[PDB]
Design a protein around this ligand. Structure first.
Ligand code: NI
Length: 341
């Protein structure tokens, strides 16, 4: 059945709750972003109002064929009324089109649902600064102190420098980048930019990127693989067998692959700095795992929560085991005692 952490009390609303059939008492279904664990259940047959960002509404219409009459896109940073309740959508610093949602309940309670987010000090200057938030529905993906990772900018600098050096040493090297969802487009776009190439990809992935309102996108991507030396492939194909096979398909245009797998966290983060990352190599194929995250590190999460000072936290991730739930609740209490709220 629908879990309680997907329901907004005092409303008829749910968040990211499309796989439970008709939810009893739901008058509006919000969708924070276009990732499959969150949209699971949507299709052209859905006939309830869906509230979301413009970009998420482009993907629902073009990729899932949801009918336009049921898609309700809202502008960001703007007070809107939905079924009698004031809401605001805020940028979540996740994937394109991903939002956080502020609900202003009729009784005076204010609720923030973060969806999936990567906390940032810039958020401390949005419309969140303007009033008190009583309850927080929190993306707790990496809520444990082992989870450190570098800034997105440091990771992009590493990838650009690595790729430019490799292709300048060997003009016959191909760069490949893995993907299985929207997000992390900076990785492949930044590498293609330094090399003076467009990114080549399948028709399906091109269609998906053309929904994202990214500026000057017609200048950066293409479905012509032959004209491109940065190729995107399914994350599943980023392994030695998959890559050897791809290289056969390029007809002797290239004699080396340098590939990137933008993972979330990996336990090489506990020891190894970004400056010291090395690839896995077989023959003329090298694979780099780079820690490009679109979720909060532990310290990032902790700073946001100690700034916001919520009265109650409701985790939305890692809620399935008692040991995870108990560990998270111990951290929330530490943060509250350290900061004095
Ligand atoms: Ni997500």
């Amino acid at each position: 059945t629908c879990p309680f952490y997907k329901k907004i009390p005092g409303t008829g609303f749910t968040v990211d709750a499309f796989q439970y059939g008709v939810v009893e008492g739901c008058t509006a279904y919000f969708l924070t972003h276009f990732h499959s664990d969150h949209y699971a259940g949507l299709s052209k047959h859905f006939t309830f109002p869906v509230y979301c960002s413009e970009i998420t509404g482009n993907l629902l219409k073009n990729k899932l064929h949801v009918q336009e009459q049921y898609i309700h896109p809202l502008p960001l940073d703007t007070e809107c009324i939905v079924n009698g309740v004031k809401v605001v959508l805020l940028d979540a610093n996740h994937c394109p089109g991903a939002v956080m949602i502020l609900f202003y309940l009729p009784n005076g309670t204010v609720i923030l649902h973060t969806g999936d987010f990567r906390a940032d000090p810039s958020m401390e200057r949005s419309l969140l600064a303007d009033q008190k938030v009583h309850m927080l529905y929190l993306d707790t993906t990496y809520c444990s102190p082992e989870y450190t990772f570098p800034s997105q900018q440091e990771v992009i600098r590493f990838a650009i420098n690595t790729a430019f050096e490799a292709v300048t040493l060997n003009p016959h090297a191909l760069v490949v980048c893995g993907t299985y969802s929207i997000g992390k487009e900076k990785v492949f776009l930044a590498i293609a930019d330094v090399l003076g190439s467009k990114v080549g990809m399948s028709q399906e992935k091109y269609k998906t990127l053309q929904c994202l309102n990214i500026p000057e996108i017609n200048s950066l991507i293409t479905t012509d693989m032959c004209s491109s030396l940065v190729h995107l492939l399914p994350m599943m194909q980023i392994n030695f067998k998959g890559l050897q096979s791809h290289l056969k398909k390029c007809g002797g245009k290239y004699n080396q692959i340098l590939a990137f797998r933008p993972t979330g966290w990996t336990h090489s983060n506990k020891f190894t700095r970004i400056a010291d990352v090395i690839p896995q190599t077989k023959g003329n194929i090298s694979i780099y795992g780079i820690p490009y995250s679109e979720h909060s590190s532990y310290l990032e999460m902790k700073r946001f929560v100690q700034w916001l000072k919520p009265q109650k936290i409701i985790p939305t991730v890692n809620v399935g085991t008692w040991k995870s739930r108990s560990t998270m609740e111990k951290y929330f209490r530490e943060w509250k005692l350290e900061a004095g709220y």
